[PDB]
Nucleic acid binder design. Structure first.
Ligand SMILES: [K+]
Ligand SMILES: [O-]
Ligand SMILES: [Sm+3]
Ligand SMILES: [Sm+3]
Ligand SMILES: [Sm+3]
Ligand SMILES: [Sm+3]
Length: 341
DNA sequence: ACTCTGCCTCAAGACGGT
DNA sequence: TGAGGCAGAGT
DNA sequence: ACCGTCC
């Protein structure tokens, strides 16, 4: 993420944010940060503070969400491609260490909340310990294949590869909550795309070109702004928040120039600041080749889906079979069969 | 008065019978 | 792999 | 729309 970027845009570039009704998206393709949505399901999809699971102890919360949400999207003629995170860049090592530190603390506090019986505390610390694993990813991929829904493995950060897919015109937008997708250059970011049958949060599109126009910046300058706001890849300058950062960038145009003009006593910069490395990472990230794989939405394998979800994962046969019928008919409505010439 | 930091707390899904 | 509220302190 | 339940 980028610290306070969403709020900053709402305050200083409101026209970059557009809202449309879900009925307007029929036929559109979108790239989805899979690892992130699996995470959301593991955290939220609970009964008695416990994830859903089959009788043999295997978690099924993530399969539950991925199955049903994907179908609801397709019912609206929205065609998702799911993108999975790869190996993190070295620059992120610091941030990851911080996370593992927090996990170690959370593990202690979980234990003591248990010897204290504090059930609501236990639930909190258990949520803090939720972690998307390789098995979670492998099960979702397996499921998506059976559903006929495409997915890709990013070489590194999935947001970066989502952005690259939008730039190449392979999908219309990147659908994620992580704003660093814009820092990676995604022309369009959709937030709150769940296509939920219960409404709530309006669908928001962020348009990068509108953002750059409103702030009066090019993409290089925008990335420098984000670094100053605070990213995962390097430190920012203490004392410099969203307000002073926009002004410094609009005036000095670059962190390099900002540092030369800043008084080393009033606003000292981080020692051995890696802003240059991060800048390079946001602008030239390692990404999949968007011309490589042709995205297709295939017919769902109904019988194998039933064996997997019902036979193995113990989902209701009625709900699953009903889901597959809906998915199949909705695909038929929004997708053209392949043609040979 | 405007700005920023540190610390707190909170929320985080989908289906279907009613 | 946040967000927003609040008190206190820096500009 | 609410809310008990989903696995
Ligand atoms: K800062
Ligand atoms: O992020
Ligand atoms: Sm990210
Ligand atoms: Sm990521
Ligand atoms: Sm079994
Ligand atoms: Sm098993």
């Amino acid at each position: 993420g980028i610290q306070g970027l969403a709020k900053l845009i709402a305050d200083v570039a409101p026209s970059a944010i557009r809202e449309n009704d879900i009925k307007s998206y029929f036929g559109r393709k979108v790239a989805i940060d899979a690892s992130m949505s699996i995470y959301q399901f593991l955290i939220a999809v609970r009964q008695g503070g416990d994830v859903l699971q089959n009788e043999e102890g295997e978690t099924t919360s993530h399969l539950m969400g991925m199955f049903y949400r994907t179908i609801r999207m397709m019912e609206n003629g929205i065609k998702p491609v799911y993108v999975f995170d790869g190996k993190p860049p070295q620059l992120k090592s610091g941030e990851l260490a911080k996370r593992s530190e927090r996990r170690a603390e959370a593990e202690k506090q979980l234990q003591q909340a248990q010897a204290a019986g504090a059930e609501q505390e236990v639930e909190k610390f258990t949520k803090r310990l939720v972690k998307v694993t390789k098995q979670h990813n492998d099960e979702c991929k397996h499921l998506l294949s059976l559903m006929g829904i495409p997915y890709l493995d990013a070489p590194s950060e999935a947001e970066a590869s989502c952005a690259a897919l939008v730039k190449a015109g392979k999908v219309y937008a990147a659908a994620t909550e992580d704003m660093d997708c814009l820092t990676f250059g995604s022309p369009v970011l959709m937030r709150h795309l769940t296509a939920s049958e219960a409404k709530k949060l309006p669908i928001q599109e962020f348009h990068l070109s509108r953002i750059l126009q409103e702030l009066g910046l090019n993409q290089e300058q925008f990335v420098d702004l984000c670094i100053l706001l605070g990213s995962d890849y390097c430190e920012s300058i203490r004392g410099i928040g969203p307000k002073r950062a926009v002004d410094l960038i609009q005036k000095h145009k670059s962190i390099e120039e900002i540092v030369r003009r800043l008084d080393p006593n009033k606003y000292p910069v981080p020692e051995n600041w890696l802003h240059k490395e991060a800048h390079q990472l946001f602008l030239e990230p390692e990404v999949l080749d968007p011309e490589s794989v042709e995205l297709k939405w295939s017919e769902p394998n109904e019988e194998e889906l039933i064996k997997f979800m019902c036979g193995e994962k113990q989902f209701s046969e009625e709900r699953i079979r009903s889901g597959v019928k809906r998915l199949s008919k909705s695909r038929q409505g929004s997708t053209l069969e392949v043609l040979f010439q």
